[PDB]
Design an enzyme around this catalytic site. Structure first.
Site, PDB file in Angstrom:
ATOM      1  N   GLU I  71       0.844  -1.184   0.000  1.00  0.00           N
ATOM      2  CA  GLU I  71       0.000   0.000   0.000  1.00  0.00           C
ATOM      3  C   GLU I  71       0.883   1.238   0.000  1.00  0.00           C
ATOM      4  O   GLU I  71       1.821   1.324   0.811  1.00  0.00           O
ATOM      5  CB  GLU I  71      -0.919  -0.009   1.220  1.00  0.00           C
ATOM      6  CG  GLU I  71      -1.897  -1.171   1.211  1.00  0.00           C
ATOM      7  CD  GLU I  71      -1.324  -2.399   1.900  1.00  0.00           C
ATOM      8  OE1 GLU I  71      -0.089  -2.478   2.053  1.00  0.00           O
ATOM      9  OE2 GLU I  71      -2.099  -3.301   2.267  1.00  0.00           O
ATOM     10  N   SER I 140       4.182  -9.931  10.843  1.00  0.00           N
ATOM     11  CA  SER I 140       3.238 -10.107  11.938  1.00  0.00           C
ATOM     12  C   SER I 140       2.460 -11.396  11.729  1.00  0.00           C
ATOM     13  O   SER I 140       2.699 -12.139  10.773  1.00  0.00           O
ATOM     14  CB  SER I 140       2.281  -8.919  12.049  1.00  0.00           C
ATOM     15  OG  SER I 140       1.153  -9.116  11.221  1.00  0.00           O
ATOM     16  N   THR I 145      -2.005  -7.297   5.727  1.00  0.00           N
ATOM     17  CA  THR I 145      -1.576  -7.904   4.467  1.00  0.00           C
ATOM     18  C   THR I 145      -0.248  -8.642   4.527  1.00  0.00           C
ATOM     19  O   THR I 145      -0.007  -9.494   3.664  1.00  0.00           O
ATOM     20  CB  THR I 145      -1.477  -6.858   3.344  1.00  0.00           C
ATOM     21  OG1 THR I 145      -0.522  -5.850   3.699  1.00  0.00           O
ATOM     22  CG2 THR I 145      -2.823  -6.206   3.089  1.00  0.00           C
ATOM     23  N   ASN I 206       1.928  -6.714  22.509  1.00  0.00           N
ATOM     24  CA  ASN I 206       1.944  -5.275  22.730  1.00  0.00           C
ATOM     25  C   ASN I 206       0.990  -4.850  23.839  1.00  0.00           C
ATOM     26  O   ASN I 206       1.197  -3.786  24.437  1.00  0.00           O
ATOM     27  CB  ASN I 206       1.652  -4.537  21.422  1.00  0.00           C
ATOM     28  CG  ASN I 206       0.335  -4.935  20.806  1.00  0.00           C
ATOM     29  OD1 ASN I 206      -0.448  -5.671  21.401  1.00  0.00           O
ATOM     30  ND2 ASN I 206       0.088  -4.459  19.594  1.00  0.00           N
ATOM     31  N   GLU I 254      24.958 -19.465  17.142  1.00  0.00           N
ATOM     32  CA  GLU I 254      24.956 -19.983  18.501  1.00  0.00           C
ATOM     33  C   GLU I 254      23.563 -19.913  19.096  1.00  0.00           C
ATOM     34  O   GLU I 254      23.121 -20.850  19.767  1.00  0.00           O
ATOM     35  CB  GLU I 254      25.945 -19.203  19.367  1.00  0.00           C
ATOM     36  CG  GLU I 254      27.418 -19.258  18.946  1.00  0.00           C
ATOM     37  CD  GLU I 254      27.710 -18.660  17.576  1.00  0.00           C
ATOM     38  OE1 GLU I 254      26.768 -18.256  16.864  1.00  0.00           O
ATOM     39  OE2 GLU I 254      28.901 -18.601  17.207  1.00  0.00           O
TER      40      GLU I 254
END
Ligand code: GTP
Ligand code: GTP
Ligand code: GTP
Lengths: 427, 49, 438, 105, 51, 31, 99, 33, 438
Positions: I71, I140, I145, I206, I254
């Site tokens: 977008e 996410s 989208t 969050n 590691e």
């Protein structure tokens, strides 16, 4: 924090709320218009107990006024403080009430309960935590009982974990003006004692005795009567809003005061009263405070509790005192008369000490008491009810409305049983 | 030991001087504000004449 | 090293802790800002203060206490007082509602949620602690809210740490004054739900405080200012062992071991001898003989139990100021010889002496005189059972007809606990008579 | 989980400031044998035949006391008033108080 | 009515109410709901997990 | 007898797995 | 009134400055010790022995200044209240006349 | 707590016979000439 | 040398990519002009920045990142904003349409015609890449989208290259907060299409970022700005090993070995202890023991999980600033000795430790403190069953009602994908559980 939503109903309430709120405002130092001016930083801090904050630093009263006659609304809007309430908070009907509690309990409230509940629970959602509510009305209120019974019954289950304090004026024993007023009282009191936790009772005849005993001012106004009762209510609520070492909360008081479920009734009583020369003659001292504090003259609610016995006493002192003096004071009074206090409880005295004075006078106090001195009132009303009922006087209005005699029967059963209740406890 | 005693005795006065100066400044603030209020009120007076 | 942690419950105890720190700061000369002059004593927190502060490189002393409250008013006032920078900003826990004299309300309804926070705080101070000889719990028995909260926190700390001390101080109910007729209920609730865990309980009464005040200090309207000042001096005296050196040293664990005779009965009395006003002390003299005789005089105790009604089991005395072992031991020998004081036939030796040179300090602008010889006295004697008889004949009367019980049974308790408490106390009185009998 | 050796002063509740003892440690084991054959598949799914502790855990009245001398029947009751609570006797940090004491006569 | 006895019987059959587990957060921490918080719940006990 | 302040210098503590001993600096009362 | 208040403020501020510097000087002094540095031969002289004040006189100096400030504050408060009351009375009387 | 039931009943009978003159729980010493 | 690539998909991503590079210019001392001040480090773009830029004879550092979005809005915003002169115009790849919360819209309808440009830019940076240890891929789960797009491009790069590392960050579905009813669908679709090519995915909630932002950040009206500075500090912490030195140094490979035991599960969780304000810190102390205890406080994990009900499988501790191995190992030993922590019977050791001398920095306008000790904790534990349990029960109910099916079937997929996802997560539950069985 935990705060309060105030309900005022009936034309009784229309006086009382206006006077009481302007009193609190003059206490916390806010102009009637709304803009604050800080003098008591503590009064600036503790304000959310009653006032929600409106921008511009104005503090809207979380109060709601309801009645059926528009003129009283117009007057309480045109008074010295009318701007202080919300056009929101004026819910009303259009028809006249006429003191017919039957219609006030079915015929007009049935269609306004929706709006009143919407607004009050809107304020409840606005605030965080509620002690409960307090209601200013009259049980002899021709519209008072009709609205109050319904709204109380609803709010019971609306918030069943709360403190629904009731502040009412009892119909005068010597004169009732309205002749169906005994009917109003007998009908209201059932649901009242069926729902309430703490209910005050105050009579105006003894207030007139106060007028000729300490007021000495010739021509008092019902507004000044309202001033007295407002001072009393303020004093009982001051413990919440100010610092100083005392226990404040309402049910903090209530568990101590009430002994049993059906015990809910109390008497107020005020502290130093003073005639025109007694200002320049009164030594403002703890001893005379306690003396008049316990006076049948000072007693003004129902009748002299001389004739009955005090179950419990609670006293609040207000100002810059200490405690050893109040301690020796009650000690003195119990030793003066241990017979008058009941034996089923020892140490029936309860005290609290708020350090912040009211505005103007340094030494102050106030009383709340539970005594076996209230049989007289509802006993009187019982004979009045039996008399007018003896041959169905004035009964056709209610039987046309939709009531019927069975309701009256259980109401009188409630009353007589309560009388025997109070008696056989104190015996 | 003597010098330490003297030090503490000084510190006392230092503390009270600071505190009292602070209240003095606050009073100056309040009086200035009330003076400005008076000034604007004098402004308001003129119209009804 | 050497340190202890203070816990305060109740708008009752916040005050008496407030006064304790109002005193405790002056002696090591910490300014109310929280900082000394620019000298070199700060560091990891290693000097005199280290027993009650952990003043790290921040140069700020950390009051090793937790002040919990349920009604934000008075605690907010101390938040806005002088010492706000001194107090640690979230050691000052405030709540939104109270228990309203209802022990069970405080014990179930609201006690369940502040406990997580308090456990957090205790563990996250214990981390930086090293010695942690124990804790000082400040509460009341006529608890408007300090009853259930204190009980449940005490049992949780008992069952999370078991191997250290618990010292309990309380304003005791008056023989014939009650600010809450719910006290005769909640007090015994606290007692019989604490005895199984409580290590050492101690009581003091405000009326007898008043009575001393107007017999000898000539103060006709003293206050909470005065009362809390006296109590703070008492606790400072009992902590002087850690604070200052002396001929010998004693510890709170020594108090526990040497005072309580048996499991169960652990309820001694406290006394402070050299109470007098400055003007009255001025043209008199204070010395070991009269100060000891006065601190054993029957009309100077702060609980209404005449010792002649009882019999002594143990005595501990701490001399604070300039004294000498010669007259110390001579005086105690004379007291032993004295007839009226009736020690029970068991204890041959019953006298925990404790000596410390450090002169006690006044509080600036306070009330007390200037004294070079103090003794603080802890005493275990049988005279206590009078008050428990008082309580039981109050309880049976106002309980048998079941007044006020509806609140409790509605909010969530039943009558079995109130059943068990009465015979708990009855067993206590039979134990008292059995232990007294010789 | 097993303990260290020799230098046994620097690893203790003395420095945890623990007041709830950590875990029963040890320096006690014989030479174990076995190639440690494999009974998992790709994830930690044990092969069915070989057993495990098959989710045995999957994932106030108590008071430390010495009987000493409190009335005999009360001591007997106190035994139960301490025990009969496996919930606060089994796991979730063990949650285990002790006992000491002597009988009556 | 011996309402003394009646109130005695009432309270004796009072039984109880039960509380609801709700915790607190901060200085003035609100009575934030606990049971189905998502934060510290007891949710893996239902007859669908895995199968 | 003119001595007034009587504090000790904490010259001993642990701070970590091994205990530690300081250098004596201030004596009885601080000096 | 503003003038007088500001003047006294300035004076007391001055003397406080003085006390701060002297206190800090002596603090810096006191950490000396026999073994340490800052250790020199400086000869005797009467400037070292000069005398300028005495403790009680210095105390009374300070005491006088304090009391002066206190009185001026009281006077300010009084004048403030008087001005407020005059404002109120003016407004009310003009209101009544117009009615 | 008494190691002999015998001493128990003995001391108890002693106390109940001395009951009247003591003070109190009727336990404290009468003292006085 | 030691360098990696950075990839951001979605309005969900360019957000915090902007945040991260905003920070990354400060601590290394870059002016938003893009040229170094009068002092001299410019050249072929090889100094400490070189791991994140190539300041070639052009004179400007160039971030080694690609900002791909469907977008134009946010990309145009950042182009018109501050840092465009730094930024490289076309690697701000923009599209014309949105996947409209449809996983298949992002995976088929649009993905075909833009992945070509994506991979071409990737290769034209890879040519100049030399060390190219790995990537920082930002996406996410409840993607508007970015979800399916990231999955498919990751498939492309996983099949073209398979000899390196790939790091995955996605805000985890808020437990009881939704900005999409299609969130369970697109989440689980991503899960079963990515479970088999990724390397290390770390989560965060969050909601909890906020919850700490008012527990100790002491603001009741935080913003995304605050949340993004926190997470950018986290990424700065993880790259500090590359950027600086110390006693001992550790790397992403590691991490990928030491944290995850087994295939499938590669989903541990992060934490950052000293989240504190200047005002709070003003008069408190910071040090190793208490910062470790705080970072292991049960409510300081920014995802809704319980240590007590969980059991640990791994922990890596990354310390930055001025510390010593002595008290480091002391603190870790205390952690092992603790009881509340319940390691599985598997891991004898459980703790990958790394140290750097360099204290993190601050930013003007930023609201962190001025801290001297930083620790990043990464832990793998069984306490995360509830998340996917919640997801699957919600999804199974609303799939039983089978709405929005019409959406997906109309755009051209079917339910077989859903069936595979369901059986996958059904496996994964007992996958987490029988390993815990011991
Ligand atoms: N406002 C006002 N009320 C008064 C006064 N004197 C007595 N009252 C009482 O106010 C009571 C009722 O107030 P409301 O509840 O508003 O009454 P209502 O239901 O509207 O109908 P009524 O009771 O007939 O007035 C009456 O019973 C009177 O006894 C007065 O002087 N002013
Ligand atoms: N410790 C202490 N006690 C006091 C003080 N003033 C009065 N008291 C006594 O302490 C008791 C206070 O207990 P409560 O009032 O129930 O306190 P609480 O249970 O924590 O909760 P509240 O009822 O809200 O105060 C009273 O009975 C007093 O007799 C004081 O300043 N300090
Ligand atoms: N990366 C990022 N995520 C955010 C931000 N604010 C909220 N979120 C969370 O991140 C998710 C954003 O996903 P989407 O809105 O679907 O973005 P998208 O899939 O790239 O496509 P759009 O529908 O066009 O936005 C939301 O589910 C939020 O929970 C933010 O500023 N940045």
């Amino acid at each position: 924090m935990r705060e309060i939503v105030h309900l005022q109903a009936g034309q009784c309430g229309n006086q009382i709320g206006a006077k009481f709120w302007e009193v609190i405002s003059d206490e916390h130092g806010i102009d009637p218009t709304g803009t604050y001016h800080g003098d008591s930083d503590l009064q600036l801090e503790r304000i959310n107990v009653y006032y929600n904050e409106a921008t511009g630093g104005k503090y809207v009263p979380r109060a709601v006024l309801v009645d059926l006659e528009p003129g009283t609304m117009d007057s309480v809007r045109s008074g010295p403080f009318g701007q202080i309430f919300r056009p929101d908070n004026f819910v009303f009907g259009q028809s006249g009430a006429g003191n017919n509690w039957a219609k006030g309990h079915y015929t007009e409230g049935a269609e306004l309960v929706d709006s009143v509940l919407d607004v009050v629970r809107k304020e409840a959602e606005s605030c965080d935590c509620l002690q409960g509510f307090q209601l200013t009305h009259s049980l002899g209120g021709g519209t008072g009982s009709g609205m109050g019974t319904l709204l109380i019954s609803k709010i019971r289950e609306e918030y069943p974990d709360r403190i629904m304090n009731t502040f009412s004026v009892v119909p005068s024993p010597k004169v009732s003006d309205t002749v169906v007023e005994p009917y109003n009282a007998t009908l209201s009191v059932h649901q009242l004692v069926e729902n309430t936790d703490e209910t005050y009772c105050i009579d105006n005849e003894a207030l007139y005795d106060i007028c000729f005993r300490t007021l000495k001012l010739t021509t008092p106004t019902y507004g000044d009567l309202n001033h007295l009762v407002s001072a009393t209510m303020s004093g009982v609520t001051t413990c919440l809003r100010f610092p100083g070492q005392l226990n404040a909360d309402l049910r903090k008081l209530a568990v101590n005061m009430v002994p049993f479920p059906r015990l809910h009734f109390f008497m107020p009583g005020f502290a130093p009263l003073t005639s025109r020369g007694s200002q320049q003659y009164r030594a403002l001292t703890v001893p005379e405070l306690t003396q008049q504090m316990f006076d049948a003259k000072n007693m003004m609610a129902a009748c002299d509790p001389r004739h009955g016995r005090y179950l419990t006493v609670a006293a609040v002192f207000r100002g810059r005192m200490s405690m050893k003096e109040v301690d020796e004071q009650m000690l003195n009074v119990q030793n003066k008369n241990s017979s008058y206090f009941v034996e089923w409880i020892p140490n029936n005295v309860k005290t609290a000490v708020c350090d912040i004075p009211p505005r103007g006078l340094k030494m102050s106090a106030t009383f709340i008491g539970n005594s076996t001195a209230i049989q007289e009132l509802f006993k009187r009303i019982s004979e009045q009810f039996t008399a007018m009922f003896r041959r169905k006087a004035f009964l056709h209005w209610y039987t046309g409305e939709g009531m019927d005699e069975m309701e009256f029967t259980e109401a009188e059963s409630n009353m007589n049983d309560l009388v025997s209740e109070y008696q056989q406890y104190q015996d | 030991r003597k010098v330490g005693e003297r030090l503490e005795d000084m510190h006392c006065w230092k503390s009270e001087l600071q505190r009292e100066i602070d209240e003095l400044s606050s009073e100056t603030d309040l009086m200035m504000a009330q003076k400005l209020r008076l000034q604007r009120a004098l402004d308001a007076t003129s119209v009804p004449y | 090293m050497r340190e202890c942690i203070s816990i305060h419950v109740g708008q009752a105890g916040v005050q008496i802790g407030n006064a304790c720190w109002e005193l405790y700061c002056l002696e090591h000369g910490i300014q109310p800002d929280g900082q000394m002059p620019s000298d070199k004593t700060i560091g990891g927190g290693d000097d005199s203060f280290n027993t009650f502060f952990s003043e790290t490189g921040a140069g700020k002393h950390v009051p090793r206490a937790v002040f919990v409250d349920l009604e934000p008013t008075v605690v907010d006032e101390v938040r806005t007082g002088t010492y706000r920078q001194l107090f640690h900003p979230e050691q000052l826990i405030t709540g939104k509602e109270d228990a309203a004299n209802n022990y069970a309300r405080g014990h179930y309804t609201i006690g369940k949620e502040i406990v997580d926070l308090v456990l957090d705080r205790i563990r996250k101070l214990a981390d930086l602690c090293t010695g942690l000889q124990g804790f000082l719990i400040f509460h009341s028995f006529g608890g408007g809210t300090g009853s259930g909260f204190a009980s449940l926190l005490m049992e949780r700390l008992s069952v999370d740490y078991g191997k250290k001390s618990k010292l309990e101080f309380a304003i005791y109910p008056a023989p014939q004054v009650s600010t809450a007729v719910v006290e005769p209920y909640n007090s015994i609730l606290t007692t019989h739900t604490t005895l199984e865990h409580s290590d050492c309980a101690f009581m003091v009464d405000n009326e007898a405080i008043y009575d001393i005040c107007r017999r000898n200090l000539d103060i006709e309207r003293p206050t909470y200012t005065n009362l809390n000042r006296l109590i703070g001096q008492i606790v400072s005296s009992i902590t002087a062992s850690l604070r200052f050196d002396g001929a010998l040293n004693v510890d709170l664990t020594e108090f526990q071991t040497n005072l309580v005779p048996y499991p169960r009965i652990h309820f001694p009395l406290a006394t402070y001898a050299p109470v007098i006003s400055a003007e009255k002390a001025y043209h008199e003299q204070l010395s070991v003989a009269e100060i000891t005789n006065a601190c054993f005089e029957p009309a100077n105790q702060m609980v209404k139990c005449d010792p002649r009604h009882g019999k002594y089991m143990a005595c501990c005395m701490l001399y604070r100021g300039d004294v000498v072992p010669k007259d110390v031991n001579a005086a105690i020998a004379t007291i032993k010889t004295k007839r009226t004081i009736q020690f029970v036939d068991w204890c041959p030796t019953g006298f925990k002496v404790g000596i410390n040179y450090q002169p006690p300090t006044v509080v600036p602008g306070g009330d007390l005189a200037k004294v070079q010889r103090a003794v603080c006295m802890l005493s275990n004697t049988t005279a206590i059972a009078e008050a428990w008889a008082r309580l039981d004949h109050k309880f049976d009367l106002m309980y048998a007809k079941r007044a006020f019980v509806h609140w409790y049974v509605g909010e969530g308790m039943e009558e079995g606990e109130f059943s068990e408490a009465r015979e708990d106390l009855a067993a206590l009185e039979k134990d008292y008579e059995e232990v007294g009998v010789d | 989980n097993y303990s260290a050796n020799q230098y046994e002063k620097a690893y203790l509740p003395t420095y945890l400031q623990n007041w709830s003892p950590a875990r029963p440690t040890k320096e006690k084991i014989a030479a174990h044998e076995g190639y440690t054959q494999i009974i998992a598949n790709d994830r930690g799914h044990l092969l069915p035949s070989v057993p495990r502790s098959k989710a045995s855990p999957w994932g106030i009245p108590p008071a430390k006391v010495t009987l000493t001398a409190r009335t005999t029947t009360a001591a007997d009751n106190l035994t139960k008033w301490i025990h009969k609570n496996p919930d606060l006797l089994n796991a979730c940090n063990g949650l285990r108080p002790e006992i000491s004491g002597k009988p009556f006569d | 009515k011996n309402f003394i006895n009646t109130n005695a019987a009432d309270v004796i059959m009072g039984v109880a109410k039960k509380p609801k587990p709700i915790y607190v957060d901060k200085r003035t921490g609100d009575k934030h709901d606990l049971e189905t918080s998502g934060l510290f719940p007891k949710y893996i006990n239902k007859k669908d997990y895995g199968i | 007898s003119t001595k007034t302040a009587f504090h000790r210098s904490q010259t001993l503590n642990y701070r970590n797995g091994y205990a530690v001993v300081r250098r004596p600096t201030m004596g009885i009362g601080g000096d | 009134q503003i003038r007088l208040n500001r003047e006294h403020k300035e004076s007391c501020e001055m003397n406080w400055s003085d006390k701060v510097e002297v206190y800090n000087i002596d603090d810096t002094c006191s950490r000396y010790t026999n073994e340490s540095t800052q250790v020199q031969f400086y000869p005797h002289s009467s400037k070292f022995e000069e005398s300028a004040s005495t403790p009680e006189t210095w105390a009374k100096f300070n005491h006088d200044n304090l009391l002066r400030a206190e009185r001026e504050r009281l006077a300010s408060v009084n004048l403030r209240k008087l001005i407020d009351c005059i404002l109120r009375d003016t407004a009310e009387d003009l209101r009544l006349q117009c009615d | 707590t008494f190691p002999t039931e015998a001493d128990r009943q003995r001391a108890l009978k002693a106390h109940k016979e001395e009951y009247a003159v003591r003070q109190g729980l009727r336990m404290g010493n009468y003292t006085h000439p």
